[PDB]
Amino acid sequence: ASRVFIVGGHITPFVGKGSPLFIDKKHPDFGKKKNMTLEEILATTVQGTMEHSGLSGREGIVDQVVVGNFLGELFSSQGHLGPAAIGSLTYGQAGSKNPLMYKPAMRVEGAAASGGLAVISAMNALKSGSADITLAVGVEVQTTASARVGGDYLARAADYQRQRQLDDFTFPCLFAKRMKYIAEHNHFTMEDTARVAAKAYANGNKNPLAHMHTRKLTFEQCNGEDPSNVKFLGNETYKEYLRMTDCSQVSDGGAGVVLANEEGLRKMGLSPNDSRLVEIKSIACAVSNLYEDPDDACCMFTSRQAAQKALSMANIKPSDLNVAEVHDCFTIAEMLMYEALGIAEYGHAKDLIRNGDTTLEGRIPVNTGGGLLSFGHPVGATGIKQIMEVYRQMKGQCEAYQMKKIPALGATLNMGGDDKTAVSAVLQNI
């Protein structure tokens, strides 16, 4: 049975309202220069990932490419990103020799789990004998529409017919609804979720790539003592359970990873114990029913299933993990993810957050670079970013947020929609 290695990757800056890199009315270059397009982001990410993986000048030995994207077709009027990817190496240089021509490529989609799904596709290709080296890249541009139109586009991840009517901000409302049930059962509090945000923003502050790098927020501000942290939903039933700072960012960006099997390492002139590597011990996907929600909003069943398949295939337990990256699309999700991954027991996510166990100096750091809340959330990119963040901590590459104890085992947990798709991976430092 065939091994699988992360050889290298790349995460772009994540940009949107609030970032100094984002060009808006207030920006020095407003009207003069533009933010990157989807094509441009995809080009930077494909090229960044080749460069950092040592493939510049021999990109022809990549056997195939998988692109994770959720809503390109709506935000940029652009689907069919497979051939977009094939043309990304030499983007804007007409006629140039393209070593990726004619190779297999596709886009895969499962809402915010698209990146994660791109990695599983790539890993199947590696273990099937159809590929020895594969490129998995995920990208998204969301800043081309308003929060309201964007919210309707993101509603595509829900059972639209059934759930769109909840609120224009369908997804924030779906997690408000969970928080209502969570409050009524005393599973954890809105104080606890403010503590998650405080952690994310503190981590972001140490991360120049993070969308919210330049924004500082105290616990008290996250807890709603700022009037600018408004409860913005229209739905009266759930309005009171969600503040702006509980929400992940509308961001643009990309992340890419190059994966290889043993034959691929050989082709690259590398040995299986080269210290630039990380092994993906296991990866697993679990998907539930779009059309039916379970009663217990305090449990992410689908994510827990994926985390358990992966930890089991890796033959380790949650306590053996040294770092993790999880799908904090809201502060509410991060709490739920601690329990889905298994690093806290059902009902004990609050213990972990109250004791700082998941902070950089805690015993099981999570979302070290700021997570979706601060790093940001260009949806298609997230699942691959998660993989690369564990990589980077493992390889000592995280600078201001580098962990002082290099982690030997790490896990990711990537989520599509309202816990309807989940992908989880176990990573082993080499």
- Residues tagged in the binding site annotation: 17, 148, 248, 327, 377
Cα dihedral 353, 359, 362, 364, rounded to 10, equals 80
Strand order in the sheet with 421-429: 64-68, 133-140, 253-260, 5-11, 278-287, 421-429, 409-416, 323-326
Among 91, 181, 219, 232, binds its own copies (CB under 8 A): 91
Report CA 149 to chain centroid distance, whole Å: 22
Residue 359's binding partner among ligand COA, its own copies, none (Cβ under 5 to 8 angstroms by kind) is: none
Q: How far is the CB of 305 from ligand COA (least distance, A)?
A: 18
Question: What letter represents residue 314's amino acid?
Answer: A
Binding site for acetyl-CoA: which residues? 17, 148, 248, 327, 377
Nearer to its own copies, 39 or 328 (CB): 39
- Told to check if 115 binds its own copies by CB under 8 A, we report no
**Which residue in the block uniquely carries the two structure tokens 């791109």?**
118
- Told to check if 172 binds its own copies by CB under 8 A, we report no
Greatest C-alpha distance within the chain: 63
Among 147, 313, 403, 430, binds ligand COA (CB under 6 A): 147
Q: How far is the CB of 130 from its own copies (least distance, A)?
A: 6
- Told to check if 247 binds ligand COA by CB under 6 A, we report yes
Nearer to ligand COA, 47 or 367 (CB): 367
User: Residue 87, Cβ neighbours under 10 Å: how many?
Assistant: 18
CA gap 215, 197 in Å, rounded = 12
Among 80, 93, 165, 230, binds ligand COA (CB under 6 A): 230
If phi > 0 it is left, if psi is from -120 to 50 it is alpha, else beta; for residue 31 that is left
Task: Name the residue among 417, 398, 361, 406 with its Cα closest to residue 113.
Answer: 417
Size of the site for ligand COA (CB under 6 A): 21
Among 119, 200, 284, 321, binds its own copies (CB under 8 A): 284
Among 27, 60, 78, 189, binds its own copies (CB under 8 A): 78
CA gap 51, 106 in Å, rounded = 22
Task: Name the residue among 33, 10, 16 with its Cα closest to residue 144.
Answer: 16
- Told to check if 109 binds its own copies by CB under 8 A, we report yes
Nearer to its own copies, 154 or 233 (CB): 154
Residues in the site for ligand COA, rule: CB under 6 A?
17, 111-112, 146-148, 151, 154, 169, 171-172, 230, 232, 244, 247-250, 329, 377, 379
